[PDB]
Amino acid sequence: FDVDVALHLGIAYVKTGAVDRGTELLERSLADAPDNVKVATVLGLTYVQVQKYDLAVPLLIKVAEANPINFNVRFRLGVALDNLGRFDEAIDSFKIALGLRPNEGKVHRAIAFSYEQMGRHEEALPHFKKANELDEG
């Protein structure tokens, strides 16, 4: 069973719409199986850079299962989910990113925006507060 072929066969089914079938393959290529996980991490993060949020998400979710405590992966998966309009998933992933680094203001900010996009202003406020008291001064 060829893993390089699974990741790329996986990603093409995601873009195609069959997000179930691809994510099976993607999962099947990152296991505690390889280092294909490094390749999936760069693709995932790059797809968020290049605003292909559609595709970044399954990767970064399966990356996150395989490397559960990569801060940048939970943070950018948050950013991508937020751009897809999946705000609860985004807050949930930003919460974990803050768990790994409680003093990244950029993460309080992002979570404040996700709440606001749901029209939940009182919940946004403390994060806006913490976001501001976590840089100068």
CATH number for the domain spanning 131: value is 1.25.40.10
* Residue-number span of the structural domain to which 83 is assigned: 1-137
Tokens at 91, concatenated: 């807050």
Residue 78 C-alpha from the chain's centroid: 5
State the DSSP code for 35.
S
Q: Backbone phi, then psi, for 38, in 5-degree steps?
A: -55, -40
Tokens at 120, concatenated: 């939940």
Resolution in A: 2.5
Q: Nearest Cα to 44, choosing from 16, 73, 24?
A: 73
Residue pair 23/14 in contact by the 8 Å Cβ criterion: yes
- Beta-carbon contacts of 99 under 8 Å, excluding residues fewer than 6 positions away, are none
| Whole-number Å distance between alpha carbons of 137 and 134 | 8
| Whole-number Å distance between alpha carbons of 39 and 101 | 24
- Beta-carbon contacts of 93 under 8 Å, excluding residues fewer than 6 positions away, are 64, 74, 75, 77, 78, 81
The count of domains in the chain is 1
| Whole-number Å distance between alpha carbons of 78 and 91 | 7
